[PDB]
Design a protein around this nucleic acid. Structure first.
Ligand SMILES: [Zn+2]
Ligand SMILES: [Zn+2]
Ligand SMILES: [Zn+2]
Ligand SMILES: [Zn+2]
Ligand SMILES: [Zn+2]
Lengths: 75, 76
DNA sequence: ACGCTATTATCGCTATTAGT
DNA sequence: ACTAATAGCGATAATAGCGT
């Protein structure tokens, strides 16, 4: 009774095919016209990793945004 | 109880309890399982990375709240 | 696009380093 | 010495991928 989460994107895991786990979307989906419906299930061991990947990306965006917002604010 | 050792196996490998070929920028274990954008090697102690992340956290909360406030102001 | 087999990854458990 | 902290193997559970 182990906990294994698919490493293939959920689309072409359903297709029971070979997933080139490319990110954000595997070539296999990109080719069958569904690039952006391609996503990978969350692993328990990539928790911290994934949460910091989000924190990182947000501080970055939030930073460049405060700038633009406050130049706008110049009425 | 004190931890002064900075691991040589990427963090994902530690988490996954496996062997890291310790290559850069990302170990091959991660590349094979497809989670390379998540591979990272500790450059600091756990307690140092923890504090560092805590402060990053606070900046996030204030920046988001500052962005929101500046967003509301913009009604007209 | 799917039954079936091949190949892989989870986690208890064994083993090694080092704090006190 | 005693044991937490750390590293990692390996049997086996469970997913990966083939060919159609
Ligand atoms: Zn795929
Ligand atoms: Zn997309
Ligand atoms: Zn896909
Ligand atoms: Zn690794
Ligand atoms: Zn790695």
């Amino acid at each position: 009774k182990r906990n294994r989460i698919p490493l293939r994107c959920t689309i072409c895991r359903k297709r029971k095919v070979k997933c080139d786990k490319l990110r954000p979307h595997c070539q296999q989906c990109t080719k069958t016209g569904v690039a952006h419906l391609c996503h990978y299930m969350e692993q328990t061991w990539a928790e911290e990793a994934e949460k910091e990947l989000l924190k990182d990306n947000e501080l970055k965006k939030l930073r460049e945004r405060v700038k633009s917002l406050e130049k706008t604010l110049s009425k």
